[PDB]
Amino acid sequence: MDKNELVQKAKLAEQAERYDDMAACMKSVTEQGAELSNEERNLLSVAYKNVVGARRSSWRVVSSIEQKTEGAEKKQQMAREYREKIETELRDICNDVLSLLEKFLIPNASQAESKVFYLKMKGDYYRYLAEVAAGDDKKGIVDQSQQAYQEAFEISKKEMQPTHPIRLGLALNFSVFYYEILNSPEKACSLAKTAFDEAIAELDTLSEESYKDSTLIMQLLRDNLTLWTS
């Protein structure tokens, strides 16, 4: 329908915790073709995070159960088959986001900040795919994730301040990708620490509109470092 109504509706769905609906509205908005506003961008991101998030939790629970019932066998196959079903939902969700990203979002991004946001997002959604990927397809997905992240990272160092939330968020996720996806805690810790240090070094570049988000994120980086350096 009207883009403006779809946004109000998305806002409504969010409040009602109907994330599937939220995502539907936001996908449609994106499909109209005009560059998303900062608000629409974040609503889209929110909707999909929650939608894919549901499946990620479910996958973890079932995976967990499947590994603990090793030796039980009949149940194990029950869990394996279910886990597989959840995986498919997940890929579909991820494939929807990535397509949005390639056909509409990354191409229409005309400012560095949104370009970085969307490329981070691409790195994130391929990361989610890497997590449930068939062994044959895995490497390709990991490279695709890394690549997106890399690109965003380059743009951000050049075009954004170290205290910018989106630059900080990228660093947070990119580092997690190294830790969790590549099993390279050295690079994960290096990336995080550096980013935190650089934000700390330019504490004076904090903006009135975003000093709260900056420090929350700085602190998230710290939490991860501490977690990893114990």
Partner: peptide, 12 residues
């Protein structure tokens, strides 16, 4: 099995 922070974060 504590999983480190990533953004955006899931709604409580």
């Amino acid at each position: 099995t504590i999983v480190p922070a990533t953004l955006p974060q899931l709604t409580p």
